Design a binder for this molecule. Structure first.
Ligand SMILES: *[C@@H]1O[C@H](CO)[C@@H](O)[C@H](O)[C@H]1NC(C)=O
Ligand SMILES: *[C@@H]1O[C@H](CO)[C@@H](O)[C@H](O)[C@H]1NC(C)=O
Length: 536
């Protein structure tokens, strides 16, 4: 005659290892990284021996032992998230009794409590299989969920191996992150998020988009993690082998890096990064987009020859930080970086020395030519130099060789692909029907900001005959031209992306990567894995 069947009393059945204040605007008030979740039960058997023994069972393995007996309560620690079956067991001299199981959710940024992401392969995306063994990466921007309507559930995930999340900002006010003042509302936004937080620690530029904004699958009022991070958690559960990296910096956010000559700040940075990774477990390492060591970035008042040395010390300590994290986590972390393809910026850093600590070098072989000049027109992301300009040194090919010349091993170089277009308007005074010899009166009409056009748009407008398509066979780069208004646009397409693929394969490079994922209709990513020799 075992004791009576226990009846649990209702308490909340959702707990969080990492807690998120779904109503905060600062980062310190937003997230609490805890080491374990506190789970509490309350049960009751009417008229029972209170000296009976009692156990709480999560998925039929024991988590708590006591007496309880009749009308009892138990609290305990759980260190790994998931969806559990909770049972309270009573025990006397004859046998045991169990209660009807109830499901609880221990949430963790692991994604353990979540189902796999439900993704979309819309548009011209065809499913591939990562048989190449080569890197196929793409950038996902944080702000892409507002007027772009590109949530994480729209990423064609079977066609990537790595995924870069842009961007992770670094705390700091006046002087430290002045580059954000160029973009409306951004500086004020970071300052809100970094309020009460020491400068030179990592944070989140937009807490709403990252963790609070309701997207597909995460609409509930009681979802601990939502937004982009929420869906990124659902992604590691769809494709566990898909590397998801956080990108720190970028063009308008790289300003604080120039202060890392200071031992004190660089150690505080690396520290906050370590916690950042423990706080957000779906990440698989660190990506550093310092633009650029030495200068020539957004801020004209920042830069130093000594920057090249601090770049090599930052990666040495970041690697060590990840090493002693692998120790504790038992996991592997990738350390990567997006560097310039300009030889004048490559010079500053000894990448042959930095490569010891790194895995992947995202060679930004794009943005060579743009609307920031009226009379220097050219190819933005061409492979080689054009016929009319043989001594062009800002090409994909030249930069790679220049980087290889340092002593960098080719397996670590990941060539960049442009999923967008840089353009001009009012091109005039050109010769031989070659618009690049002409000059422009301004930037072309842009998709979001003028001077930049999404490939999605370009491809559509070509099929409507609103453009003239030309392909430079020598430089391996397409462009479109409208003789009337004098509009000229540089970009990458299917053809040139394949040739970047052949180049990587022939020269035994690392693979390809694209900026940005939402500017594609599926044609360039397809060219990316056909060119790298993937399977369909
Ligand atoms: C291009 O030309 C227009 C008018 O000639 C001028 O307003 C603009 O500042 C120029 N842009 C650059 C980058 O020189
Ligand atoms: C374009 O601008 C440059 C500026 O130095 C000038 O030398 C050149 O003649 C211009 N080309 C035309 C076709 O006006």
């Amino acid at each position: 005659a075992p004791p009576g069947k226990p009846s649990l009393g209702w308490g909340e059945r959702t707990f969080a290892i990492v807690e998120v204040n779904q109503a905060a605007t600062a980062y310190n008030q937003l997230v609490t990284k805890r080491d374990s979740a506190d789970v509490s039960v309350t049960w009751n058997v009417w008229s029972g021996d209170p000296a009976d023994k009692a156990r709480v069972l999560l998925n039929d393995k024991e988590f708590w032992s006591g007496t309880g007996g009749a009308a009892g309560s138990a609290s305990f620690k759980v260190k790994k998230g998931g969806r559990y079956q909770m049972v309270v067991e009573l025990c006397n001299a004859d046998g045991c009794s169990q209660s009807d199981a109830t499901e609880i959710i221990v949430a963790d940024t692991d994604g353990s409590h979540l189902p796999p992401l439900d993704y979309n392969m819309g548009e011209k995306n065809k499913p591939f299989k990562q048989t190449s063994g080569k890197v196929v990466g793409a950038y996902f921007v944080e702000w892409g969920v507002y007027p772009r309507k590109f949530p994480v559930d729209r990423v064609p995930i079977p066609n990537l191996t790595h995924l870069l999340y842009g961007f992770i900002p670094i705390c700091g006010g006046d002087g430290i992150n002045d580059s954000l003042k160029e973009i409306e509302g951004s500086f004020q936004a970071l300052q809100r998020s970094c309020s009460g937080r020491e400068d030179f620690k990592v944070s989140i530029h937009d807490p709403w988009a990252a963790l609070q904004k309701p997207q597909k699958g995460l609409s509930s009022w009681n979802e601990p993690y939502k937004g982009n991070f929420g869906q990124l958690m659902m992604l590691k559960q769809a494709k566990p082998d898909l590397k998801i990296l956080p990108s720190i910096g970028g063009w308008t956010l790289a300003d604080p890096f120039f202060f890392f000559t200071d031992e004190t700040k660089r150690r505080r940075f690396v520290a906050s990064v370590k916690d950042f990774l423990q706080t957000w477990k779906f990440f698989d390492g660190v990506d550093i987009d310092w633009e650029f060591p030495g200068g020539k970035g957004a801020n004209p008042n920042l830069g130093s020859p000594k920057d090249g040395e601090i770049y090599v010390l930052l990666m040495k300590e970041l690697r060590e930080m990840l090493n002693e994290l692998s120790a504790e986590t038992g996991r592997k972390y990738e350390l990567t970086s997006a560097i310039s393809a300009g030889w004048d910026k490559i010079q500053v850093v000894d990448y042959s020395a930095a490569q010891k600590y790194m895995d992947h070098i995202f060679f930004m072989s794009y943005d060579f030519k743009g609307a920031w000049s009226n009379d220097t027109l050219g190819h933005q992301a061409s492979l080689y130099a054009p016929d009319w300009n043989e001594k062009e040194t800002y090409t994909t090919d030249f930069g790679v060789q220049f980087l290889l010349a340092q002593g960098v091993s080719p397996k670590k170089i990941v060539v960049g692909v442009a999923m967008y277009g840089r353009g001009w308007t009012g091109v005039h005074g050109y010769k031989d029907n070659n618009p690049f010899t002409g000059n422009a009166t301004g930037p072309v009409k842009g998709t979001w900001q003028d001077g930049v056009v999404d490939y999605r748009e370009i491809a559509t407008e070509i099929a409507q005959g609103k453009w003239e398509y030309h392909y430079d066979k020598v430089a391996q780069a397409p462009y479109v031209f409208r003789p009337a208004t004098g509009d000229l646009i540089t970009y990458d397409d299917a053809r040139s992306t394949i040739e970047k693929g052949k180049y990587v394969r022939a020269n035994k490079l690392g693979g390809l990567f694209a900026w940005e994922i939402d500017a594609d209709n599926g044609d360039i990513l397809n060219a990316m894995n056909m060119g790298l020799g993937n399977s369909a």
